[PDB]
Design a protein around this ligand. Structure first.
Ligand code: CLA
Ligand code: CLA
Ligand code: CLA
Ligand code: CLA
Ligand code: CLA
Ligand code: CLA
Ligand code: CLA
Ligand code: CLA
Ligand SMILES: CCCCCCCCCCCCCCCC(=O)OC[C@H](COP(=O)(O)OC[C@@H](O)CO)OC(=O)CCCCCCCCCCCCCCC
Ligand SMILES: CC1=C(C/C=C(\C)CCC[C@H](C)CCC[C@H](C)CCCC(C)C)C(=O)c2ccccc2C1=O
Ligand code: SF4
Ligand code: SF4
Lengths: 161, 42, 139, 742, 80, 60, 151
């Protein structure tokens, strides 16, 4: 398929991975009696292993010659659920954390003693700020354009060189 | 509840440990109910 | 003014931290002070000695060793009567501290400023400017 | 009655107000942070009580209540070990089959595939195999039930609550005055007689009435649920007299001094129990009874309130001769007014005792079925070597803190301290020479052997097959200890330990203990030990003796115990403090203890541990390769680290895969430490300046200005990660190796 | 020897002279600062280079500036 | 400038170069650095105040 | 009774008079030793020290050397001792050249001429002592063995 890879649902090496992974657990299950707590635990592990391989086979992942799933991250939309979409979820959460922390340090600067607000956090105000993060791309872009994100170069301390 | 005990629970290490334990706790719970999420399913 | 070599010394049971061959071949330092009491102090070179009531004389290998005892004698026993000398192997005695009878921390007339630069430190010349010329980097 | 209890009532108010103001305990930190250094300076000086307060009374009160908090933590920890033994263990399965079931008291949750760590330890059980030797302790105690482990967990929980209450009570409600703490005679009388003496007496009583009947029934072959409960031995004296017929006469032989009646249960057998490979518990019961008598007798030495006894001041001031001036005068004043002097002594002793514990516990295995549980033997040796080495370096740490802070020359004129400081150049130069001599003549023998073996000259090596450096004195002492039963210990039946010579003790076809022969390789590695111990002493002693002043810095005491340097002048005075000799000596302690545990691990696997074949042949774990390969460094690299690291590297996908992960993680942490060790603060502060610029550009600069860590803290962080990384690497390597092969 | 310089931003606080373990610095009269005094270094041959004077300096950039130079027996702190 | 005003530092070797401090006092004598500026941020030395000249200080 | 006193009745000197440092036995031994012996020429000082050092150098090279098991062990040991003597005499020569400024007086080791005389004596003594050890070990079978000839 893509990059000479094979879909995991029809690769024989993924199937032998699943079969070997289940044989390892079945030989551990072969030393226990049916209703015992270790046997029940081992059987649930076998069920989880089968579910993982069954889900991966039908997911559109591409396996290598080694039978392990490979991620295609060049931007193609048939594989966007492996990096582009998880990455968009990350950048939303990361920008949330960044916007929320930036808003709290700007609040803490306007305090009576700014450095106590950073070792003893004003938790109601900081929770107001953690609620602010859900619309950070718009809040931060309006902040950027309204001249409130970027400070001018002549307001920043720099070394003599 | 005492205001000095609440000001103690607002200290940086307590909030850091509680928030990262809560964070760790929902990563653990999300990987318990919905394990093996190598990809966003689509 | 000159060091009276006959000044009695503090009671020290000796130590291995004292001066070595460079004291008798390069320079030795001496410190004298007057004590109102027969009191124990700590040697810069080791353990404890007892300074005698009256005038004491010490022989150290470093000027910092002398000034360390001087601070111990001024902060714990309040002696301000310490004179630090550098004694050459030739026998020349050079008075050092306090150099003009007044402590360096107090202003004194007739002191000429050495090392004083008329501008602030950010106005020092860059090394490229002073390269391949004898001109100094302090302007 | 000059020894009296005196307490201030309600000294400190139990309020949460100071909890809410971090840094309250010092004048510097209480005004709040302005840089991030404050944050680090908060944790660094918190337990430094004598840096906060001038008064010895408030310092002593803080120490007493912090010791109760530590005891509360230890009791909570013990209660958890008993609860995990009761609830998450195969202890009952292990009791039935101690030689096949592997001890396990930790079960993991199935979350991210980590349930592979619940390996098949045996007894119809899955869990993490535990190597702390608790199962062998509990069998030695005679627990034989998980219900009794729940009762021990509750007893630990009650003690943990009582200690945390006592710390609160003795700091906030009834805090003793300084004159209470300055009763060294009373404290020694009570800690010898009461703590150690009634501790041994009560433990000997428990052993006689509980451990001895239950373990006789266990070794007879009785199943654990067929064994009478431990109080049925207390009441049914007839049933107790079946196992030990001396109980038919009761306590009349004790009081009438007819003690040879009690030889059924108070023996002097020596050697090991053939069934368990552990010490005879009748010997252990007699051992603890004899220690109890001497400890109680010892605790009557000192004078408290009735004229009988010694004044320790009189003992010390009378011991003075012609070489030592005023002698031990002034040492009593030191040790009852300086907590650091006491901590220096007690940490050096507790570390020495922990080191003694590791040697004696492997050689004379004290618990049933602990000798043939090789993961436990390796774990508790390695653990008590590390606790010993750390505590010994903390003894030198607090010797340095005493010298910098609590030492007063006025009260220490011409005594033993004055004389040591007044010949410290002779001490450090002779120690320096012995360390150079002993690095040349121990490690240079290894370099000679590497060179000769690499050059094809096997006849030119120091080896058993070539030039033989035999340990004649150690072999001779081994001869004496093998000849001692019936000769110089006539009433002993067996040797103190089979390590000296004698039989091979096998339990479940695995060697419990067997003679440890010493050859050229053992001579070489013992002189490696003498060298690494000497150099650690040199760094720690050089730091203690030069803590206050040097020829380099004549006023080092004014800079403190822990300062980074006194500038780049005098050539450079980097790491001139006593703290920096503790810092440098903890590396050499690490080096010393790492070679000791490597010597132990290789020697026990190569020459002691293994399986007993038919005809009594012992196939050892690494097949006797120590003798001809521990003489070269390439042998230690190849036949010890490379050969035995096979289990950690190949542990993935098994229950020991956590050890492979910790092996790699600790290699990471160790390397990560070298970022803090090889670098300096000025680089990181200028890098932080550029990062601060990037924050300023986005108006996200913090109000607590970020700083690079202090020079001392960069050293401390580097050392802490280095020790964690190295020890964790050895911990993972040792544990995966010996769980797989032993 | 080391070279020790005092710049005209010196406020005459006398702290660098007090810090000096080797009597390198002393105070001379100067009308530039409110205190009427500036530090001077007429004894840089005794300077060990410890830079304790720099630590004691409360000016944003140390008015006292030690520049480590040629080493001698005195500037190396050698008691031998 | 005048006492109490907020000022921007133009001394390139200052810790607080192009940062804002506030003027505490200004001497009237022949002092080389009369403007005493106090700053919220502390320097690496821990000092939070320094004396500057007029041509090194601009009102904001 | 105190057995340790300040050295030379000077407390601040960097030494302590101790039984090991300042007993009459220690003073007698040092004075008796050729390096500190009064009335001894620098050349004669070198001859006595050299005879001693060359004599005992042969034995470790002979007994523990690479050619120890060979029948040429003594010749190899002597040559190795002799080579070490030549390296050491070069060390003595170079130390003398750099340490001591040329002065007319030769009556002391700490003079250019005196150290040259000492080095001359040390070479003659060391080669002679090494030779004496070679002659003795070759003649005596017991010396050829490690003391196991009786066994
Ligand atoms: C002291 C030694 C010790 C140790 C090392 C352990 C270790 C463990 N126990 Mg055991 N346990 C102990 C004592 C101990 N226990 C005792 C004394 C009891 C009796 C009460 C138990 C009873 C017990 C049970 C019943 C179970 C365990 C389990 C476990 C495992 C997981 C626990 C867990 O994830 O909690 C995580 C729980 C949380 C709530 C998360 C903690 C996050 C918070 C924020 C902690 C922060 C502390 C706080 C910040 C401190 C400041 C206070 C505040 C005022 C500022 C782990 C192996 C489990 C196990 O083995 O399963 C197989 C299990 O089921 N333990
Ligand atoms: C015989 C009486 C006695 C006993 C048993 C102890 C025991 C102890 N003292 Mg000492 N102490 C005593 C008298 C005694 N003290 C006196 C008279 C003084 C005044 C001079 C002091 C002053 C003193 C100081 C200043 C300090 C101690 C500390 C300690 C603890 C050491 C840590 C340890 O190993 O605990 C673990 C061992 C244990 C056995 C834990 C058990 C805890 C209890 C208290 C033991 C006794 C229980 C009870 C008597 C037993 C009843 C038996 C019953 C079931 C039949 C330990 C609990 C140090 C400490 O840690 O402070 C807390 C400490 O700093 N003590
Ligand atoms: C380092 C080189 C590089 C870079 C930066 C990119 C970057 C990108 N690729 Mg390309 N790609 C590359 C190499 C590279 N690719 C290579 C070597 C291959 C193998 C032939 C591909 C094959 C590939 C395919 C087949 C596709 C991409 C697409 C994309 C885009 C992803 C989503 C996006 O923004 O669409 C724009 C969407 C938005 C701006 C908003 C959507 C919400 C992105 C511009 C996808 C695309 O959109 O093509 C333009 C697409 O279909 N890439
Ligand atoms: C920055 C690097 C990085 C990245 C991108 C990921 C990404 C991921 N990890 Mg990995 N991981 C990392 C570092 C990283 N991890 C580290 C450092 C460790 C060691 C502590 C692990 C150990 C680890 C394990 C053991 C597991 C993951 C899992 C996951 C998945 C999380 C999806 C999820 O929570 O669904 C949760 C469900 C939702 C609905 C949300 C995702 C593929 C899990 C997984 O799915 O594996 C494929 C899993 O089981 N990670
Ligand atoms: C970080 C501290 C630390 C930790 C976590 C451990 C952890 C462990 N130790 Mg070790 N230990 C340490 C420090 C530590 N040790 C030190 C400093 C010493 C020297 C005193 C010892 C001496 C020691 C011995 C002698 C034994 C252990 C044992 C154990 C294990 C069971 C725990 C238990 O219930 O002990 C319970 C302890 C016992 C059942 C025996 C106690 C016998 C000692 C002699 C009691 C002395 C008490 C007395 C108050 C000490 C005063 C000090 C003295 C110098 C005045 C466990 C692996 C046991 C073990 O390895 O079994 C497999 C064991 O027999 N420890
Ligand atoms: C602190 C530890 C401790 C404690 C609490 C006890 C407690 C007890 N012991 Mg034990 N005992 C101990 C240490 C201890 N002992 C030690 C160290 C030894 C060795 C010398 C013994 C040897 C011993 C024997 C041999 C016997 C007891 C007996 C008893 C019981 C006394 C009944 C009686 O007077 O009959 C005494 C009978 C007479 C005829 C008098 C009592 C439960 C007796 C008992 O009932 O055994 C279960 C008994 O026969 N003890
Ligand atoms: C009975 C033992 C004992 C006691 C009571 C003390 C008590 C004290 N020591 Mg001493 N010390 C000890 C043992 C002890 N130490 C040992 C064994 C060592 C050798 C390592 C030292 C080395 C030492 C030095 C070098 C110094 C002290 C200092 C201090 C004082 C304050 C320390 C502080 O606030 O730290 C607060 C506690 C911490 C900052 C904890 C951090 C330590 C490590 C990094 C944490 C370990 C984490 C864990 C074990 C492993 C990580 C696991 C990871 C995977 C999560 C205090 C007087 C210092 C002082 O101020 O002198 C007066 C000082 O300079 N001690
Ligand atoms: C493997 C690396 C290594 C080596 C070889 C050394 C070597 C040494 N260290 Mg160092 N050290 C190291 C790592 C090392 N250290 C590390 C990582 C730390 C981290 C904190 C320290 C910290 C440290 C301190 C703090 C101290 C030492 C001390 C010593 C000396 C011990 C005395 C001795 O054995 O002399 C014998 C010399 C050796 C064993 C070096 C190996 C030489 C072998 C035997 C062959 C010789 C080759 C020969 C000269 C070839 C000549 C021909 C050739 C020149 C052409 C010695 C110079 C101590 C010291 O100097 O005081 C005595 C001391 O106090 N070390
Ligand atoms: C150790 C050998 C020994 O027996 O020392 C014993 C010797 C004993 O001296 P004193 O008889 O003066 O000891 C009297 C009291 O200090 C003893 O309580 O101590 C010394 O002379 C110092 C030795 C330092 C170590 C030298 C090496
Ligand atoms: C990296 C590094 C820094 C920079 C390191 C810093 C500023 C530490 C900051 C790390 C973050 C900010 C916190 C660390 C938290 C860790 C994830 C875990 C810490 C665990 C304890 C701190 C609780 C120094 O300051 C330094 C100073 C002297 C010698 C070497 C070095 C050095 O190597
Ligand atoms: S410290 Fe800085 S400011 Fe104070 S006097 Fe010395 S130089 Fe002038
Ligand atoms: S460096 Fe040390 S010595 Fe030289 S001047 Fe500054 S303080 Fe005085």
């Amino acid at each position: 398929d893509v990059a000479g890879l094979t879909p995991c649902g029809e690769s024989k090496e993924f199937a032998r991975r699943l079969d070997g992974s289940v044989k390892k657990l079945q030989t551990r299950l072969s030393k226990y009696e049916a209703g015992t707590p270790p046997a029940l635990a081992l059987q649930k592990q076998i069920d989880k292993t089968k579910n993982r391989f069954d889900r991966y086979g039908k997911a559109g992942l591409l396996c290598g010659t080694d039978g392990l799933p490979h991620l295609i991250t060049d931007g193609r939309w048939t594989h966007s659920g492996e990096f582009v979409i998880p990455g968009l979820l990350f950048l939303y959460v990361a920008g949330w954390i960044g916007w929320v922390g930036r808003s709290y340090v700007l609040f803490a600067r306007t305090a009576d003693k700014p450095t106590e607000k950073e070792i003893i956090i004003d938790v109601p105000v900081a929770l107001s700020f953690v609620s602010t993060g859900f619309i950070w791309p718009f809040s931060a872009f309006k902040e950027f354009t309204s001249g409130n994100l970027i400070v001018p170069a002549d307001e920043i301390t720099v070394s003599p060189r | 509840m005492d205001s000095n005990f609440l000001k103690y629970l607002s200290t940086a290490p307590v909030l850091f440990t509680v928030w990262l334990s809560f964070t760790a706790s929902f990563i653990i719970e999300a990987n318990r109910f919905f394990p093996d999420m190598l990809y966003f399913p689509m | 003014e000159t060091l009276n070599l006959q000044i009695p010394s503090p009671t020290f049971e000796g130590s291995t931290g004292g001066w070595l061959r460079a004291a008798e071949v390069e320079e030795k330092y001496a410190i004298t002070w007057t004590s109102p009491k027969e009191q124990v102090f700590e040697m810069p070179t080791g353990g404890a000695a007892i300074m005698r009531q009256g005038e004491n004389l010490l022989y150290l290998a470093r000027k910092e060793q002398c000034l360390a005892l001087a601070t111990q004698v001024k902060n714990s026993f309040k002696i301000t009567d310490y004179k630090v000398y550098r004694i050459f192997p030739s026998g020349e005695v050079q008075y050092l501290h306090p150099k003009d009878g007044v402590f360096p921390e107090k202003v004194n007339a007739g002191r000429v400023g050495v090392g004083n630069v008329s501008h602030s430190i950010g106005k020092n010349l860059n090394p490229a400017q002073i390269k391949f010329t004898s001109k100094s980097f302090n302007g | 009655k000059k020894v009296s209890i005196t307490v201030d009532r309600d000294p400190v108010a139990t309020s949460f107000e100071k909890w809410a103001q971090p840094g309250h305990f010092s004048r510097t930190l209480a005004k709040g942070p302005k840089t991030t250094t404050w944050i680090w300076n908060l944790h660094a000086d918190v337990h430094d009580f004598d840096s906060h307060t001038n008064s010895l009374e408030d310092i002593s009160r803080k120490i007493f209540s912090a010791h109760f908090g530590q005891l509360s933590i230890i009791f909570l920890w013990l209660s958890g070990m008993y609860f995990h033994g009761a609830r998450f263990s195969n202890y009952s399965a292990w009791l039935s089959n101690p030689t096949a079931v592997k001890p396990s008291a930790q079960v993991v949750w199935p979350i991210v595939g980590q349930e592979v760590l619940n390996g098949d330890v045996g007894g119809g059980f899955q869990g993490v195999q535990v190597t702390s030797g608790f199962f062998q302790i509990w069998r030695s105690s005679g627990i034989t039930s998980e219900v009794e482990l729940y009762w021990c967990a509750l007893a630990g929980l009650i003690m943990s609550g009582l200690m945390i209450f006592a710390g609160w009570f003795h700091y906030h409600k009834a805090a003793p005055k300084l004159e209470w703490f300055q009763n060294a005679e009373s404290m020694l009388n009570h800690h010898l007689s009461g703590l150690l003496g009634l501790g041994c007496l009560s433990w000997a009583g428990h052993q006689i009435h509980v451990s001895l009947p239950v373990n006789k029934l266990l070794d007879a072959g009785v199943a654990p649920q067929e064994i009478p409960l431990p109080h049925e031995f207390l009441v049914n004296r007839d049933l107790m007299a079946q196992l030990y017929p001396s109980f038919s006469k009761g306590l009349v032989p004790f009081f009438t001094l007819n003690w040879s009646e009690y030889s059924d249960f108070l023996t002097f057998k020596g050697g090991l129990n053939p069934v368990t490979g552990g010490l005879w518990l009748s010997d252990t019961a007699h051992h603890h009874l004899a220690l109890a008598v001497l400890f109680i007798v010892a605790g009557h030495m000192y004078r408290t309130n009735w004229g009988i006894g010694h004044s320790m001041k009189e003992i010390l001031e009378a011991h003075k001769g012609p070489f030592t001036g005023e002698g031990h005068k002034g040492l009593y004043e030191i040790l009852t007014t300086s907590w650091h002097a006491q901590l220096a002594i007690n940490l050096a002793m507790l570390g020495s005792v922990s080191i003694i514990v590791a040697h004696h516990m492997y050689a004379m295995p004290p618990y049933p079925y602990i000798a043939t549980d090789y993961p436990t033997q390796l774990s508790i040796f390695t653990h008590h070597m590390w606790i010993g080495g750390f505590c010994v370096c903390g003894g030198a740490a607090h010797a340095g803190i005493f010298m910098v802070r609590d030492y007063n020359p006025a009260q220490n004129y011409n005594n033993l301290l004055d004389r040591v400081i007044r010949h410290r150049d002779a001490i450090i130069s002779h120690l320096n020479w012995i360390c150079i001599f002993l690095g040349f003549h121990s490690f240079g023998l290894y370099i000679h052997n590497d060179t000769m073996r690499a050059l094809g000259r096997t006849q030119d090596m120091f080896s058993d097959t070539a030039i033989q450096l035999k340990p004649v004195f150690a072999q001779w002492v081994q001869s004496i200890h093998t000849l001692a039963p019936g000769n110089t210990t006539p009433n002993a039946l067996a040797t103190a330990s089979y390590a000296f010579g004698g039989d091979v003790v096998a339990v479940g076809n695995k060697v419990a203990m067997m003679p440890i022969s010493l050859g050229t390789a053992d001579f070489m590695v013992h002189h490696i030990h003498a060298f690494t111990i000497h150099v650690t002493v040199l760094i720690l002693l050089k730091g203690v003796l030069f803590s206050r002043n040097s020829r380099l810095i004549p006023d080092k005491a004014n800079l403190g115990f822990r300062f980074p340097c006194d500038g780049p002048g005098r050539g450079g005075t980097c790491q001139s403090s006593a703290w920096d000799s503790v810092f440098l000596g903890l590396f050499w302690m690490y080096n010393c203890i790492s070679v000791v545990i490597f010597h132990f691990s290789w020697k026990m696997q190569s020459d002691v541990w293994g399986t007993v074949q038919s005809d009594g042949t012992v196939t050892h774990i690494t097949g006797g390769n120590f003798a001809q390969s521990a003489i070269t460094i390439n042998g230690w690299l190849r036949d010890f680290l490379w050969a035995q690291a096979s289990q950690v590297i190949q542990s993935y996908g098994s229950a020991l895969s956590a050890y492979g992960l910790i092996f790699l993680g600790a290699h990471f942490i160790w390397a990560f430490s070298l970022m803090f060790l090889f670098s300096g603060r000025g680089y990181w502060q200028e890098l932080i300046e550029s990062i601060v610029w990037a924050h300023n550009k986005l108006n996200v600069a913090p109000a607590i200005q970020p700083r690079a860590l202090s020079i001392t803290q960069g050293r401390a962080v580097g050392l802490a990660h280095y020790l964690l990384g190295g020890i964790g690497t050895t911990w993972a390597f040792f544990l995966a190796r010996i769980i797989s092969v032993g | 020897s080391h070279s020790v310089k005092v710049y005209d931003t010196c406020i005459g606080c006398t702290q660098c002279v007090r810090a000096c373990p080797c009597d390198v610095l002393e105070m001379v009269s100067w009308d530039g600062c409110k205190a009427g005094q500036i530090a001077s270094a007429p004894r840089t041959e005794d300077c060990i280079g410890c830079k304790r004077c720099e630590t004691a300096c409360p000016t944003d950039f140390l008015s006292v500036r030690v520049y480590l130079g040629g080493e001698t027996t005195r500037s190396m702190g050698l008691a031998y | 400038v005048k006492r109490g005003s907020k000022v921007r530092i133009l001394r390139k070797e200052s810790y607080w170069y192009q940062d804002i401090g506030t003027v505490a006092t200004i001497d009237t004598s022949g002092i080389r650095y009369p403007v005493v500026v106090r700053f919220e941020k502390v320097s690496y030395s821990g000092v939070n105040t320094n004396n500057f000249s007029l041509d090194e200080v601009v009102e904001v | 009774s105190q057995f340790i006193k300040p050295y030379n009745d000077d407390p601040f000197v960097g030494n302590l008079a101790t039984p090991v440092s300042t007993s009459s036995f220690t003073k007698s031994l040092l004075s008796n030793l050729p390096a500190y012996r009064a009335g001894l020429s620098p050349l004669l000082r070198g001859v006595e020290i050299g005879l001693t050092h060359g004599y005992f150098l042969v034995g470790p090279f002979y007994k523990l050397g690479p050619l120890r098991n060979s029948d040429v062990a003594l010749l190899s040991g002597f040559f190795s001792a002799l080579g070490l003597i030549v390296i050491l005499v070069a060390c003595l020569t170079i130390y003398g050249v750099v340490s001591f400024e040329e002065t007319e007086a030769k009556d002391q080791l700490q003079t250019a001429k005196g150290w040259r005389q000492f080095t001359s004596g040390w070479l003659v003594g060391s080669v002679g002592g090494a030779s004496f050890a070679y002659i003795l070990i070759s003649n005596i079978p017991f010396l050829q063995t490690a003391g196991m000839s009786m066994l």
